[PDB]
């Protein structure tokens, strides 16, 4: 899997592939790894599907209860902290890599990265999963400060396409989401819509 | 396997208004027979029987625990257990130990308390119930006795024909395995009577 988030001014763009695998068999080619933890907080899920689904539902439950009792929209840092506490306390028994991204009025668009082992880092762009390895260079070169929302969407699409073509575990369609004060705009890129890059073609 | 440690064979068959349940008699530790009189078929009712093959210790233990549960059931509810209900009880008992399983492969054979419709079933190590209309088998020699049953069995058999079929199948099957044999006992259950016969078999 490849999961990728990037922070633009006033929001975030999240992106992920649709492929989940058991060995070399693609059990689901249309999986949705971008889940709503809250109305404006999402998590990109990478690692064991069962572990990630369980932890995502638990954090959704806790953050909803916290949000209602505080009578305030929850904070992305709060969601990331809950994810960290769970993943760290169960680091031995858990195999999950999460990118927590969302928008809150206090701190704007935020992206947080929870790798395996239970640590929290805030990052301007974060990539995770098996396929992020192949696109570290592309994101390092391509990333520029102060990208627009559409520019970040194209950037995420291109990176995920590269990782998808170069990684067997990654594949399918690209699922993209843009979270901001206005709301979540979710889109799926399929077939020709997915960015394509030339082959050597001797 | 641990199941092969003591060794055993149990069979049940369905005729017309009758059932037959048959099992070997050997008790031996990996190769050395100790006794030719082991009880592997136990009565769980007037015309309901259970047959256990596997480890001798778990055979006796699950038989005793099931009789505990069944006697309390019969006293509390004032009726004889239906065969399907005994199947479900045995499955619950075995699945209770899904980890660290009792090493047995039970077989239930009996007639319905009222209809007298015949019932045969088998359960796995961890209580998977399988109900069949022709035959069920369990033990080390499942392969041989499966083939022999698949050939010999015919639907709507008479009691005498059922006895002949089950006897031939058990004898010829236990002849072709090392760890089971030393005689075989056949119980025939009919609505009006129980007939138990011990066959003449190779003591090798």
């Amino acid at each position: 899997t490849t999961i990728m988030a990037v922070q633009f001014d006033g929001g975030v763009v999240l992106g992920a592939d649709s492929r989940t695998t058991t060995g070399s068999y693609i059990a689901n080619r249309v999986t949705d790894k971008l889940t709503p933890i809250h109305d404006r907080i999402f998590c990109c899920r990478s690692g064991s599907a069962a572990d990630t689904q369980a932890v995502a539902d638990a954090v959704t439950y806790q953050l909803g209860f916290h949000s209602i009792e505080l009578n305030e929209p929850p904070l992305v840092h709060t969601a990331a902290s809950l994810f960290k506490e769970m993943c760290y306390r169960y680091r031995e028994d858990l195999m999950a890599g999460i990118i927590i991204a969302g928008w809150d009025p206090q701190e704007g668009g935020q992206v947080y990265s929870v790798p395996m082992g239970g640590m929290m880092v805030r990052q301007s762009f974060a990539i995770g999963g098996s396929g992020s390895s192949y696109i570290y260079g592309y994101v390092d070169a391509t990333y520029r400060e102060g990208m627009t929302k559409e520019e970040c969407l194209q950037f995420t699409a291109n990176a995920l396409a590269l990782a998808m073509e170069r990684d067997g575990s990654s594949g399918g369609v690209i699922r993209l989401a843009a979270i901001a004060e206005s709301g979540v705009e979710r889109q799926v890129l399929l077939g020709d819509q997915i960015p394509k890059f030339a082959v050597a073609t001797l | 396997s641990i199941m092969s440690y003591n060794g055993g064979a149990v069979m049940a068959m369905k005729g017309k208004n009758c059932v037959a349940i048959a099992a070997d008699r050997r008790f031996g530790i990996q190769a050395q027979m100790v006794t030719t009189d082991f009880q592997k078929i136990f009565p769980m009712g007037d015309r309901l029987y259970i047959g256990l093959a596997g480890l001798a210790t778990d055979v006796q233990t699950v038989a005793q625990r099931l009789k505990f549960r069944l006697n309390l059931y019969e006293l509390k509810e004032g009726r004889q257990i239906k065969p399907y209900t005994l199947m479900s009880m045995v499955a619950n008992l075995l699945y209770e130990k899904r980890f660290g399983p009792y090493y047995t492969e039970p077989v239930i054979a009996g007639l319905d308390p009222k209809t007298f419709k015949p019932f045969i079933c088998s359960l796995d190590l961890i209580g998977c119930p399988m109900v069949t209309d022709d035959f069920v088998v369990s033990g080390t020699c499942a392969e041989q006795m499966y083939g022999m049953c698949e050939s010999l069995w015919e639907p709507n058999m008479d009691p005498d024909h059922l006895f002949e079929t089950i006897s031939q199948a058990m004898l010829n099957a236990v002849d072709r395995d090392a760890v089971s044999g030393m005689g075989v006992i056949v119980h025939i259950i009919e609505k009006d009577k129980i007939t138990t016969r011990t066959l003449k078999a190779r003591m090798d």
């Binding site: - | 100790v34 006794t35 001798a56």
Partner: protein, 197 residues
């Protein structure tokens, strides 16, 4: 490594065991008694891993004697066999399995003589004759050869002597002396030790 043998008869059960307790190679004891009287007319013979034998034997002995004191009548041999089998089988699943191989011999006024056999996995079987240990492999054929259900007790001690001198002839370990005793309606009777010098 330890030998138990039991012969049932019309009105008796004969039991014998080797008298050796041993370390690695040294035979620390020449007169070890592996027979425990649970009651007046029942004996328990036990062999197995060290410690487990004496612990389990003593536990069953004290439970049976508690039954005697509480209820005023002795347990039946069959009931004692089922009880010790239950205790052994429960421990098998547990983290403290008693690795013990037992032979229970008894006389009941109603049901006559009985010999019972159980392995470390806690199977139980009534038998006309039985043996435990590596020597059992050598000596069972002697019993299977010359045994009769109507064997008299003099014939039984003779048969046992044949079985044991076969161990003397062929078995690798040295089991020089054996203890012998009979249970009957009168009760447990000690017999002269069958000693092959």
């Amino acid at each position: 490594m330890e030998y138990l043998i039991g012969i049932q008869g019309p009105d008796y059960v004969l039991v014998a065991s080797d008298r050796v307790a041993a370390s690695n190679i040294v035979q620390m004891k020449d007169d070890h008694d592996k027979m425990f009287k649970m009651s007046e007319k029942i004996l328990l013979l036990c062999v197995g891993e060290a410690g487990d034998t004496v612990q389990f034997a003593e536990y069953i002995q004290k439970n049976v004697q508690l039954y005697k004191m509480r209820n005023g009548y002795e347990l039946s041999p069959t009931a004692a066999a089922n009880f010790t089998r239950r205790n052994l089988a429960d421990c098998l699943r547990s983290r403290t399995p008693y690795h013990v191989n037992l032979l229970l011999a008894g006389y009941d006024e109603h049901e006559g003589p009985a010999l019972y056999y159980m392995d470390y996995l806690a199977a139980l079987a009534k038998a006309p004759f039985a043996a435990h240990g590596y020597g059992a492999f050598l000596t069972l054929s002697i019993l299977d050869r010359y045994y009769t259900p109507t064997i008299s007790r003099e014939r039984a001690v003779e048969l046992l002597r044949k079985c044991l001198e076969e161990l003397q002839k062929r078995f690798i370990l040295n089991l020089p002396t054996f203890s012998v005793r009979i249970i009957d309606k009168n009760g447990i009777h000690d017999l002269d030790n069958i000693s092959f010098p």
